[PDB]
Amino acid sequence: ANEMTYEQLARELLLVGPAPTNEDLKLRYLDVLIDNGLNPPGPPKRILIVGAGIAGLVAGDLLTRAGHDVTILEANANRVGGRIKTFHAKKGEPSPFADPAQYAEAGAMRLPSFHPLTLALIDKLGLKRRLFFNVDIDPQTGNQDAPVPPVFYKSFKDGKTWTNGAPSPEFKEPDKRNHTWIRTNREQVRRAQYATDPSSINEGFHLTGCETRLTVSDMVNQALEPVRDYYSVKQDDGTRVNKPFKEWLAGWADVVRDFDGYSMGRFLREYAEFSDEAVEAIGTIENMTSRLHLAFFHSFLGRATYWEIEGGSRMLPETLAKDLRDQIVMGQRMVRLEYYDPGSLTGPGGPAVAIQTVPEGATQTWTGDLAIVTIPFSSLRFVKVTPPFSYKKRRAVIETHYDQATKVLLEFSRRWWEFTEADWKRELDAIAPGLYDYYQQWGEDDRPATNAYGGGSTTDNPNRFMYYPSHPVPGTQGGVVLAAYSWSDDAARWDSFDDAERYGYALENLQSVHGRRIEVFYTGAGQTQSWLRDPYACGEAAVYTPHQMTAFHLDVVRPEGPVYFAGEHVSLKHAWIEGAVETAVRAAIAVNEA
Amino acid sequence: ANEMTYEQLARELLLVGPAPTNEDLKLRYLDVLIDNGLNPPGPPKRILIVGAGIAGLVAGDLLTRAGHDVTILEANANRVGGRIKTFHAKKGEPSPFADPAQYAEAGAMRLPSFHPLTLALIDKLGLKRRLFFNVDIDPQTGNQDAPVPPVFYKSFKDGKTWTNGAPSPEFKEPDKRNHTWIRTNREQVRRAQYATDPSSINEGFHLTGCETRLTVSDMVNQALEPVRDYYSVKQDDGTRVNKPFKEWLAGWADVVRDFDGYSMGRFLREYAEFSDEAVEAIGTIENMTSRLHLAFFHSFLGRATYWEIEGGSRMLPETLAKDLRDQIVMGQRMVRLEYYDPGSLTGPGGPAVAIQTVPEGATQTWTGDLAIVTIPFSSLRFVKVTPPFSYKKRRAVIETHYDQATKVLLEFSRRWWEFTEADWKRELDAIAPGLYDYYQQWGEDDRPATNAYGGGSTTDNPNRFMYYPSHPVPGTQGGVVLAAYSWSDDAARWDSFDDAERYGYALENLQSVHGRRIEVFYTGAGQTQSWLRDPYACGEAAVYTPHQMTAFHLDVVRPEGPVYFAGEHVSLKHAWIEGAVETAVRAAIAVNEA
Amino acid sequence: ANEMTYEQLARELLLVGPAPTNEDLKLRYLDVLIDNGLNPPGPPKRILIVGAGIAGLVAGDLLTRAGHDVTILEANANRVGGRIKTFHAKKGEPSPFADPAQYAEAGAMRLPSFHPLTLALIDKLGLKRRLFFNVDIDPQTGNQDAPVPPVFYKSFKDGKTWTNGAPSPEFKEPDKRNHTWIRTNREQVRRAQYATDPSSINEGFHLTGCETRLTVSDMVNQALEPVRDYYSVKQDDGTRVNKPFKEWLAGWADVVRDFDGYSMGRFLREYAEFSDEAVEAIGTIENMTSRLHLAFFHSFLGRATYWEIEGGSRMLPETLAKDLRDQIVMGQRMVRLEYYDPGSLTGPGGPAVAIQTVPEGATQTWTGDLAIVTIPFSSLRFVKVTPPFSYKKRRAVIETHYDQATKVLLEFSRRWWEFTEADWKRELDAIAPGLYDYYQQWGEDDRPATNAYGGGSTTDNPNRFMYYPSHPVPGTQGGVVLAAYSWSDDAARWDSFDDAERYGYALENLQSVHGRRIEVFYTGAGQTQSWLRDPYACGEAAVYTPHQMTAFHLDVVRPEGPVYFAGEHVSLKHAWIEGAVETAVRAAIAVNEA
Numbered sequence A, B, C: 001a002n003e004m005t006y007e008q009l010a011r012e013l014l015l016v017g018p019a020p021t022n023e024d025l026k027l028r029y030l031d032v033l034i035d036n037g038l039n040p041p042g043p044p045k046r047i048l049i050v051g052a053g054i055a056g057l058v059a060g061d062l063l064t065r066a067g068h069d070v071t072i073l074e075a076n077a078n079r080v081g082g083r084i085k086t087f088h089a090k091k092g093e094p095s096p097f098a099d100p101a102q103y104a105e106a107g108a109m110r111l112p113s114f115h116p117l118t119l120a121l122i123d124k125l126g127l128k129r130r131l132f133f134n135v136d137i138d139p140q141t142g143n144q145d146a147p148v149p150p151v152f153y154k155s156f157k158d159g160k161t162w163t164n165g166a167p168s169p170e171f172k173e174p175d176k177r178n179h180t181w182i183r184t185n186r187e188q189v190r191r192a193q194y195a196t197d198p199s200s201i202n203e204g205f206h207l208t209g210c211e212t213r214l215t216v217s218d219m220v221n222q223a224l225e226p227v228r229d230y231y232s233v234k235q236d237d238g239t240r241v242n243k244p245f246k247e248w249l250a251g252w253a254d255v256v257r258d259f260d261g262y263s264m265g266r267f268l269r270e271y272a273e274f275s276d277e278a279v280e281a282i283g284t285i286e287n288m289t290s291r292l293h294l295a296f297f298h299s300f301l302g303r304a305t306y307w308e309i310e311g312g313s314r315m316l317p318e319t320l321a322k323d324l325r326d327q328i329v330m331g332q333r334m335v336r337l338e339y340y341d342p343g344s345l346t347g348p349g350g351p352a353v354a355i356q357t358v359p360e361g362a363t364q365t366w367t368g369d370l371a372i373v374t375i376p377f378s379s380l381r382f383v384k385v386t387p388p389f390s391y392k393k394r395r396a397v398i399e400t401h402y403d404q405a406t407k408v409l410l411e412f413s414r415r416w417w418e419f420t421e422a423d424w425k426r427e428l429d430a431i432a433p434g435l436y437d438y439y440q441q442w443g444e445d446d447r448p449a450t451n452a453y454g455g456g457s458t459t460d461n462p463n464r465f466m467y468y469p470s471h472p473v474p475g476t477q478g479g480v481v482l483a484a485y486s487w488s489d490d491a492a493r494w495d496s497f498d499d500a501e502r503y504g505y506a507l508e509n510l511q512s513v514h515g516r517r518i519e520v521f522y523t524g525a526g527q528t529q530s531w532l533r534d535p536y537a538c539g540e541a542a543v544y545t546p547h548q549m550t551a552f553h554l555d556v557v558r559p560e561g562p563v564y565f566a567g568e569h570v571s572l573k574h575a576w577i578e579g580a581v582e583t584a585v586r587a588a589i590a591v592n593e594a
Ligand SMILES: Cc1cc2nc3c(=O)[nH]c(=O)nc-3n(C[C@H](O)[C@H](O)[C@H](O)COP(=O)(O)OP(=O)(O)OC[C@H]3O[C@@H](n4cnc5c(N)ncnc54)[C@H](O)[C@@H]3O)c2cc1C
Pocket: A050, A051, A052, A053, A054, A055, A056, A073, A074, A075, A076, A079, A080, A081, A082, A083, A084, A106, A107, A108, A109, A110, A111, A112, A332, A333, A334, A335, A374, A375, A376, A379, A380, A405, A407, A531, A536, A537, A539, A540, A541, A566, A567, A568, A569, A574, A575, A576, A577, A578, A580
């Protein structure tokens, strides 16, 4: 009965269908979203969708295009897209950065190539995608002028493959350079230096013995290898292939069983037997610190390739919205939801769903035959739901935590991160004679040139993670850095500062890593995003605690009479867009054939 | 080496001194704070204190009264006391509630009688204390007119006792009635009904088998009994006495060893082998839900007696502040801290400590010989500290989480919670003839009279916990309810609403439990406290995750050259005032005899 | 010595012969019963057979046809066939149901297609067989007009197969619909509804956690899968094939060893670790309740195909009896049995067997050379046996329990179970205008149309199991329902009621499931069978308790000097006819070649 549950969860995880068939639901979603859409088996239905983030838009588009009467209620008054949010200049208000060409991501910023549906959907919309440099690169290497590789998916069904165009064999990502920084414990090296000799940064973390000699990267990878062995095999090639479907699924089932009880921290301590100092170091270097006490699965799931969308992530939501001007109602917030499930405004023969919204944050009533709720559970918590959902669904709405996240963006007049030392001499002397020599004397609070292209630097200071844009905005001399990106307590302290203080601290921190002298190129333009203070999100992502997945995720996905659910949290890919998209499709399929 | 650490932690927990002596540090603190103060072994020193919450005030008072030159830097511009915060009318601004006599607690509200130092300190200041009714009472029982019992502490040193006055044998707390509500899963009973037959509320939680038959109270107690047996023994009397010092300390040491690896949730699931449904129920009814994933110790530690201070909790901080008008600098926020530890503004023979503050949130520099930092670690995180603290102290500042907490207070023109049904007829008909009959017809959204005195009601809805004042404010007809008190995700959603929406939702929720008809007595006055948005707190309390205590708490308490630390987080009584007070004294003792 | 016993028991279970050969005794029985009969190796013998149920008739026919002098003594005065009993109209007495064409089964009603010998024997007698709908079907699907599939058996001997005619490839059973009812805990759904969402009925059973999400069907199947794996393998096809003979037999041997110690209840609780609530639910839904405390094997053994015999089950016994008019003595009950086993009326050179009967329930003496006793052990218990049987045989007669079973049959003037709602309007308005509208208002004791064809409904009320006839009797408008079929305590209470009260309660119960309005079509004709009060049965079946099989079943089958044994109980297929038939043949083979 437990084994039965683990099997069911693994199917959820791996997108596998019921037993007499074992379908590749990745193929079904691709087909439907991309190739064919939906065909209604009978008359169009009235359908209501709450939330005009990516999940609500995707399902809205599919159900509209198949001929259904769709209404999309979005609490936000001026913005669709939810946790897809770009700071961009818009005609009629001042530009978010001094240079009005500049833009930057408030929310989602990178898309994995092991995430097909979202990449397929971007291509289908004829949006242009480029490589997101998660590690800093050599930009006089690779071939990015060649066409973007088509989406290429391989099924477990054997020989079944899905693509959306012809190969691009001459396309090639740039070499990773790893010239960016690790600054922990008042020590500082380049990622490449750490890789060749990790003791430098490890002694600062007070790792001793055989740990000192190992990178945090290798530690985490080795730790996970036995886990991986449950559903796959490292061949003599040194490569990894999934086992046969049965032993591959039972394996993932046995992963659920043996490891959902753990947090990442307890896994590293207890299973991989690492020192508290190693876990400390792993957390800081590998962005795990604040999620160590949360489910191992959250960290476990998520040289791979990442993608950004020319013009910012917003293009994906906004493009979809163009097809749905007629269906999208902005500035309406669901406060009540009533539905009729055989086994006041609803009933037999009357409408089966009734939603009531209020303006912004008047009292409209909306009715229909079926519903999709795509709003985060944080926000669902404060909606009055007339017949309660199932016990475990209600528990899921109560118990699912959302992590705080804040981003802090600083515009620079130049892309100082690229500069060689020589570049710094040129670029400072250009502002005033002697300015190089000045910053050279003055020095720092108790730095060599970064000379990096994309990627980011990692630190223990509150900024934590600093990302450089992967691609320059055509024709501009400057760029926007993600100066601070932090979670949990840090975020909350970032939030409670004044704009000036927050941008001051973010710059002091950037300066601690990069040099005082970066101050000269700051334009005084900064933007902040505080996902906790977002009324319609209250965080970045649904992050589960140990055993939560096991105890109620199968109830998260279930319909509730005529009410269906989609969104990032509905999937087992928490913190990603694919999950919201996979589940939008899934939802859309379901309400179509009801 | 592990056993050695567990022993040391248990001494920290139990306030036991080093081995060749094994002193009762509760006796030392009482003596010093209450009876004698401190005697400096040599010349007075310059001492700087950061934070004018309870810890900074207590140590400020002790060190000033012993003759030292103390300065207290408090970032807040108009308010001392920190997480001790009362909403009270103050001459010159409008009253926080329509009735200007009314007040209510934003922060700390109740003091345990198993917490001597703070109770002793309230008596020593000649502040008046009354019983805090954590469970609702029969108010025609007990004797509270008799003198307040003196603080009476018993040491483990054998026959050593501490009191601050003569006995009060005729003083007697009121009988617990338990007429207040449990409203979970759209079901509702009185605590007393649950106690006699818990199946009603338990089936709503889908507890089955032998759990259905048991109260959550009894489940938690039984669960903890074996743990308790490690350092104590349940005698045939049915009572519990601590074992002999050695087996009592080794026991607490073995508690640290065997259980710090757990969260409360994992303890209940894995150790006490409870169903996920029972843990669900336990969490909701026993206020554990949001802290299930945090350390078992946090929940484990904290028919016992509680105390409130006539005039509000603020009296304790504010009274202390009167003695320290000359030492307290308001509106100054530490941004930098520099110190000289043999083994710029500081050095040998120069001053040993230098702090720099900024106005509110100009750049003053403050120097001295020794320092106490009593600010929460959330706030310490963003202070520049010139020689870094020890590695594990820095890790503690980084890794110690603070929980979000929000309180929502609603003034009522009458104390409807007291009313019998008859009282409701009288009190509504008084507003307009027929008004009783009206609310009787109209009814509810799909309630009997509460008729309770003090205590609170517990629910699954976002309010979660609703507390009724224990004592009426003399001469007033109304009262302030704590309508909503919530943590984690709930708090963050509460926070992001508008005052009107927040007070609207809080009242709808109160009405779901108590009756629609309570609406009539609402005065439209409400106050909110959002401890996450407090720049100087960023939460209620330092709450540790599993193993954190084991890995770095011994480093939390250590001095850092001439820098000492006190405050709620410095102790192993997280979430209480005693801990901040015990550690203020401890700190004060230490800097005195340096 | 234990392993030796388990091996021997598995051979018994699987019909495998001794080691130097390992014959398929299914092939021997088919050959003998069906193709060839028996050839006596020497002169015909005098043979006496007790009991003219299926086992006594089968062996009587074989031994008569091979030329032996057979006498069959049947205690019953007017009826052969034993637990094969049909209520049918017979010229000269009133019809059992108002419509004299109607008939129904008192005893055995369905024959599995995994039971070859009995199906072969029905074909050989040129009796017509049709599908027994154990689950309700879609009757506008399948092909039953095609010839009945021939009996097709596959041996473990490899490539050895047995059939009794040419294939019928166009014959095809109807699709299962599952529109019949589950009514448990005052809740009611269609089997198909339970299958798609089992929580409805499961919450009524107070299953929680991961059980709530699973059907009782899937639970039982999964539970048994590891057991199955002992002697077979689930191939990647998702199908199941027996392992190689040696590992297949050792496997069944290891099944005997590891699981005969269990009851079904203790298996589900202890081995499959199910909640007492799940076992409750499993018992009620899957007809196991009253046999949970009996051997796991009983339940373990017994989408498969079932057969009924046109004209009722009686045809099989009665047809056989026609060939044996000369051998069958009716109305004689064995009271004494005397026999001469070298190592009064019997002795050396005298006759070797002597039986004494009494009329009905005069004192005839019957002699002969060999005997077969086919009477149930309940009845054998009260027979005086001159030289005692072996100790363990005597223990088997004492200790083998027979389960009480009662059937209650109610004739209806129409087959209301078939009806759509529309059909009900038509069929009630036909009795009197408004009658539909009447029952619609009046309603029920605190029901939708069944609209089902064959199968049955399952409930917790005393009826327990209600079966609808699979095929209409040609030319009739009505039908007989098996309204109540119950075991153990229920049966005994059914029994002690008056005909009118029993038929009243059975109808109230039917009405609780199906609708009050079914009352109109009741003809006031009902029949009861109480197998406990049957003097010649005293129950339905020999049902073993845990370990009984292990301790004495090898002694059950052994001859006792010239006395052989056959019948349902002699086999390891307790509760079936095949077992009585397999053992009749086995017996007949043995006495032939003595
Ligand atoms: C800082 C950050 C960075 C991220 N980076 C990445 C990344 O690099 N790669 C990646 O793959 N994913 C990333 N993600 C995750 C990704 O952005 C989300 O998982 C995804 O956008 C989920 O969309 P959704 O439709 O499920 O929900 P949302 O985007 O939350 O949409 C919900 C919508 O509901 C509306 N709404 C809420 N309540 C109501 C109400 N009561 N009535 C009406 N409307 C309401 C909201 O206004 C909103 O538009 C990131 C997320 C964050 C926060």
